[PDB]
Each structure stands twice: as structure tokens, then as C-alpha cells.
């Protein structure tokens, strides 16, 4: 049996920064700032979670599926940005 944190009033926690994909707590970037994979929607994805999505993934946020961007520890991939095309018709979302 447990509750969460010691003492009465809870301590800074369960904010959300904690990645959702795997769970691990989204640490800090190579510089120090908070590592926020996706900001547009706000999908909590650690470092080893964002890169992949672009490495082997599809390069589209699994929450909003928006255009990505070369991060600190994320080398460019084949599908970062494309040019306007005659492909219209939003099948899903
Ligand atoms: Zn993760
Ligand atoms: Zn997103």
C-alpha cells in the first residue's frame, strides 16, 4: 500500500514532463533546458523517443503528427521537409 510522496502536501511531481511513450522522466537537453520533443501539441517524448520516431519511425508526432525539426541529439533524416505537391485529401485527421 502506497500513496505517492512522503508527508502531507505533495512535492513538485506528476507535472507531465515525464515521457508518455515509454514513461521515463524527460531529462534535460544537452544544454540544460527542458527537452520537449513536441511543443505544438505538447507530446511528452524523451530524447530516445523523439529521434527514433524520425530514425525508424515516420517522422510524425504520434499525438499530433506535425512536422518535426532537427533537435540537438537528432540528426537530419529522410523526410524532414517536403515541397508542395498536388496531393490533397485529408483521409484521416
Ligand atoms: Zn520515452
Ligand atoms: Zn505533437
Amino acid at each position: 500500500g502506497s500513496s505517492g510522496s512522503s508527508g502531507p502536501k505533495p512535492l513538485k511531481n506528476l507535472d507531465g514532463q515525464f515521457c508518455e511513450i515509454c514513461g521515463d522522466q524527460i531529462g534535460l537537453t544537452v544544454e540544460g533546458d527542458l527537452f520537449v520533443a513536441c511543443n505544438e501539441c505538447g507530446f511528452p517524448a524523451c530524447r530516445p523517443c523523439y529521434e527514433y520516431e524520425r530514425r525508424e519511425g515516420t517522422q510524425n508526432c504520434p499525438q499530433c503528427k506535425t512536422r518535426y525539426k532537427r533537435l540537438r541529439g537528432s540528426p537530419r533524416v529522410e523526410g524532414d521537409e517536403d515541397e508542395e505537391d498536388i496531393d490533397s485529401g485529408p483521409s484521416s485527421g
Side-chain angles (χ1 to χ4, degrees), residues 19-24 26 44-49:
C19 175
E20 273 275 300
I21 300 173
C22 66
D24 287 43
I26 301 177
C46 58
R47 218 182 289 181
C49 266

Side-chain angles (χ1 to χ4, degrees), residues 43-78:
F43 189 49
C46 58
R47 218 182 289 181
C49 266
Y50 173 107
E51 297 154 76
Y52 152 70
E53 188 79 341
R54 271 160 54 82
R55 195 281 191 290
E56 270 208 315
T58 59
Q59 318 152 331
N60 322 299
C61 181
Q63 169 150 300
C64 70
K65 310 272 200 73
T66 310
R67 55 168 159 179
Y68 269 132
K69 75 287 204 151
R70 211 153 83 160
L71 297 189
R72 285 190 208 277
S74 188
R76 170 269 182 163
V77 293
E78 271 174 62

Side-chain angles (χ1 to χ4, degrees), residues 78-92:
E78 271 174 62
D80 181 52
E81 171 192 46
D82 296 295
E83 71 201 60
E84 180 177 318
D85 275 273
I86 61 90
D87 65 329
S88 73
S91 302
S92 181

Side-chain angles (χ1 to χ4, degrees), residues 3-11:
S3 178
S5 184
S6 295
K9 290 275 169 65
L11 207 83

